Amino acid sequence: GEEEYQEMLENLREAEVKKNA
Amino acid sequence: GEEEYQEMLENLREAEVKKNA
Ligand SMILES: [Ca+2]
Ligand SMILES: [Ca+2]
Ligand SMILES: [Ca+2]
Ligand SMILES: [Ca+2]
């Protein structure tokens, strides 16, 4: 549902932070 | 690349809109 979608977005956000580090 | 990451996010968003509908 919607919170599983938000959790996916947070995993992606974390990955991007690491990419950009 | 950044914009390719944003376009991916946009596809993910369009698919969640449909699911939530
Ligand atoms: Ca949560
Ligand atoms: Ca969380
Ligand atoms: Ca986190
Ligand atoms: Ca674009």
mmCIF file of C-alpha atoms and ligand atoms in Angstrom:
data_model
loop_
_atom_site.group_PDB
_atom_site.id
_atom_site.type_symbol
_atom_site.label_atom_id
_atom_site.label_comp_id
_atom_site.label_asym_id
_atom_site.label_seq_id
_atom_site.Cartn_x
_atom_site.Cartn_y
_atom_site.Cartn_z
ATOM 1 C CA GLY A 1 0.000 0.000 0.000
ATOM 2 C CA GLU A 2 0.931 3.633 0.336
ATOM 3 C CA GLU A 3 3.387 3.203 3.239
ATOM 4 C CA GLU A 4 5.183 0.396 1.357
ATOM 5 C CA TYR A 5 5.440 2.875 -1.555
ATOM 6 C CA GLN A 6 6.881 5.517 0.793
ATOM 7 C CA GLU A 7 9.335 2.957 2.174
ATOM 8 C CA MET A 8 10.505 2.193 -1.360
ATOM 9 C CA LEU A 9 11.007 5.900 -1.947
ATOM 10 C CA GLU A 10 13.085 6.083 1.258
ATOM 11 C CA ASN A 11 15.276 3.158 0.130
ATOM 12 C CA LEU A 12 15.834 4.953 -3.183
ATOM 13 C CA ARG A 13 16.522 8.252 -1.422
ATOM 14 C CA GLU A 14 19.143 6.533 0.727
ATOM 15 C CA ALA A 15 20.769 4.979 -2.367
ATOM 16 C CA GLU A 16 20.945 8.370 -4.064
ATOM 17 C CA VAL A 17 22.521 9.940 -1.034
ATOM 18 C CA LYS A 18 25.242 7.326 -1.196
ATOM 19 C CA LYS A 19 25.577 7.789 -4.986
ATOM 20 C CA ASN A 20 25.992 11.513 -4.444
ATOM 21 C CA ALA A 21 28.582 10.919 -1.691
ATOM 22 C CA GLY B 1 21.391 10.913 -14.269
ATOM 23 C CA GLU B 2 19.782 13.218 -11.973
ATOM 24 C CA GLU B 3 17.042 13.794 -14.529
ATOM 25 C CA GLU B 4 16.876 10.081 -15.426
ATOM 26 C CA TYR B 5 16.493 9.326 -11.619
ATOM 27 C CA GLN B 6 13.612 11.925 -11.551
ATOM 28 C CA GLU B 7 12.010 10.365 -14.612
ATOM 29 C CA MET B 8 12.192 6.930 -12.934
ATOM 30 C CA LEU B 9 10.566 8.395 -9.837
ATOM 31 C CA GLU B 10 7.865 9.863 -12.047
ATOM 32 C CA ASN B 11 7.097 6.447 -13.546
ATOM 33 C CA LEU B 12 6.932 4.962 -10.035
ATOM 34 C CA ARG B 13 4.564 7.775 -9.045
ATOM 35 C CA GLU B 14 2.224 7.261 -12.045
ATOM 36 C CA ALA B 15 2.020 3.537 -11.229
ATOM 37 C CA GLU B 16 1.170 4.190 -7.530
ATOM 38 C CA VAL B 17 -1.551 6.702 -8.565
ATOM 39 C CA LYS B 18 -3.186 3.949 -10.591
ATOM 40 C CA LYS B 19 -2.824 1.472 -7.783
ATOM 41 C CA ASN B 20 -4.301 3.799 -5.272
ATOM 42 C CA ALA B 21 -7.223 4.388 -7.633
HETATM 43 CA CA CA C 1 7.241 3.262 7.504
HETATM 44 CA CA CA C 2 10.816 4.902 7.561
HETATM 45 CA CA CA C 3 16.354 6.368 6.228
HETATM 46 CA CA CA C 4 12.493 15.145 -17.814
#
